[PDB]
Amino acid sequence: SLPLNAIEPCVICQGRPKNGCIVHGKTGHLMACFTCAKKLKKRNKPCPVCRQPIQMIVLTYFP
Amino acid sequence: SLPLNAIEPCVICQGRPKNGCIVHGKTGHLMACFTCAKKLKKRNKPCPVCRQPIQMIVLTYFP
Ligand SMILES: [Zn+2]
Ligand SMILES: [Zn+2]
Ligand SMILES: [Zn+2]
Ligand SMILES: [Zn+2]
């Protein structure tokens, strides 16, 4: 939960770091990778929590 | 990467539970609040790592 050093992996594959912040309209998701995000995007999946259809994925870094 | 252990709070204001992922030039910064981002946005600050002038902020929730 820390604002630093918490460079944790994905929530589905969990093999790779959480580098792939996802956005659906005006809100987004944390703790999933670019791979898992790209997969759910190609499938056009409505978010498993927010239920919103995703729009984009970005290369995500830390301070 | 699944339980409550993924808050990723503020890093400048006070360390409060708020979230606010930032996106500049198709790349982005995670592990700060909406106020952290808004503060550096209005001051038009070039990123302390990427050196890019920031463009967007969104409510980025976790599992
Ligand atoms: Zn993954
Ligand atoms: Zn969502
Ligand atoms: Zn803050
Ligand atoms: Zn940056």
Report how far ligand 4's centroid is from the alpha carbon of A49 (Å): 28
**3-state SS of chain A?**
CCCCCCCCECCCCCCCECCCEEEECCEEECCCCHHHHHHHHHCCCECCCCCCECCEEEEEECC
Residue of B nearest to A5 (CA): B31
Diameter of chain B by CA atoms? 35
User: Method used for this model?
Assistant: NMR
Nearest to A34 by CA among B46, B30, B3: B30
Alpha carbon distance B34, B59 (integer Å) = 7
Instruction: Measure CB to CB from residue B26 to each of A2, A9, A59 and give the nearest one.
Output: A59
> Which domains does chain A carry?
1-63 (3.30.40.10)
Alpha carbon distance A6, A57 (integer Å) = 20
Which residues on B lie below 8 Å from A11 (Cβ)? 1-2, 63
Instruction: Measure CB to CB from residue A61 to each of B4, B29, B61 and give the nearest one.
Output: B29
Specify the length of chain B in residues.
63
